[PDB]
Design a protein that fits this description.
Chain D: This is Nucleoporin 210. Chain D: It is found in: Nucleus membrane. Chain D: Belongs to the NUP210 family. This is part of a larger assembly, with four copies of chain A. Chain A contains one helix and ten strands. The first copy, chain A, has one helix spanning 94-97, and strands at 2-8, 15-21, 33-39, 46-52, 64-69, 74-78, 84-88, 101-108, 120-124, 130-132. The interface between A and B is medium-sized, with 21 and 20 residues.
């Protein structure tokens, strides 16, 4: 999830770790363990430490299926349950379950009332990962 | 400029933009005569095309063309040379050792494919040559497969 | 000077694999603890004129049912290789 | 007209080589592009000629 390096602050006896992430933290990263070694320029000693750190629907296509992949449970919601219906599709075939693939049916709550850009919400069960569709 | 830098961040000079979130926004040209384009961010389907290929010879590659579509609306993504859709993917064979596969981007396009190559000649112990395909974005903030 | 599927059962415990070639053919099991493989000697000259190699194929015990064990087949050239 | 050819030589059988004769049903009636079908006995693998 991250890289690190050692730096001496230019013009002082002040020193630092600099850390730079590679991505966003998934619900599969318990810790970001920093390690720090220090030595003299000749390595006649070393000393170290470890520290923790859109969809469209129509009268010809009134259902969409949202597929989402995750190694943790996913909540999916409408901001408006008067314009929109959202239901989890139960994967009764076994092959589906091996792929960590959550499935949600997405529908208009009535075929008499057109609407636009209603936000579907998506989140991981630790509350950390979020997305809007 | 962008109408929402959190949906779509853009470089004010070289016009380069990155799709950060799923949603709808604009890119705006500030210099007069001023202008705008709307932008929409959504993969929810794969099609593979067979192009009349059947696996009858181990000294051939079988090269199967990919098409990718939006979530919910099933619209095919723009195959245009001003874009990189930033699509990564993995093609493999399942159940059978009769072939290997890989994922490939057609050099100089938003066109993508599976390539399949056999290990031998088909014994009547082989029920299928099951192709598997994942696609994901460059960061794996999601995956989708078939 | 130097030179350079099958099924078996308690009613049919032997199969005969016939293979035609103008060059010698090795035939192998990947598992010689579940399976037995032996070349059949063609004592009739009629079989020899057909270039027809023959192998008997058997379970190594009649107490141990098994599935999909690969028999290997190859030419003395080493590249005309097949699996059954 | 389509008929399987019986391989009475054992050499053909050792090659696993299935053979079919293919003919016009009359020599008075020219035709074009009529699909012959081919299928494996599991109902899976197919080809059209």
């Amino acid at each position: 999830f991250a890289t690190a390096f050692f730096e001496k602050v230019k013009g002082k006896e002040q020193y630092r770790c600099v850390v730079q992430p590679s991505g966003v933290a998934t619900s599969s990263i318990d810790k970001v363990t920093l390690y720090v070694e220090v030595s003299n320029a000749h390595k006649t000693y070393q000393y170290d430490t470890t520290i923790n750190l859109k969809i469209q629907l129509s009268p010809r296509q009134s259902t969409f299926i949202l597929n989402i992949q995750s190694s943790s449970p996913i909540f999916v919601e409408s901001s408006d349950n008067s314009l929109l219906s959202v239901q989890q599709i139960s994967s009764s075939g076994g092959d589906d379950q091996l792929n960590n693939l959550y499935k949600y049916a997405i529908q208009p709550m009535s075929v008499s009332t057109s609407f636009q850009n209603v936000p579907l919400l998506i989140s991981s069960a630790d509350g950390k990962s979020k997305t809007t569709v | 400029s962008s109408g929402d830098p959190s949906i779509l961040q853009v470089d004010p000079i070289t016009g380069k933009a990155t799709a950060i979130a799923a949603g709808t926004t604009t890119i705006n040209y500030i210099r007069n005569p001023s202008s705008q384009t709307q932008v929409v961010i959504s993969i929810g389907r794969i099609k593979v095309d067979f192009s009349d290929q059947i696996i009858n010879n181990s000294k051939k590659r079988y090269e199967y063309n990919l098409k990718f579509f939006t979530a919910g609306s099933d619209i095919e993504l723009s195959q245009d040379s001003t874009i990189d859709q930033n699509i990564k993917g993995i093609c493999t064979i399942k159940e059978s050792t009769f072939a290997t596969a890989f994922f490939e981007k057609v050099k100089g396009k938003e066109q993508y494919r599976c390539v399949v190559q056999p290990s031998g000649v088909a014994t009547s112990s082989i029920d299928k040559v099951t192709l598997y395909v994942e696609v994901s974005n460059a960061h794996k903030t999601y995956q989708y497969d078939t």
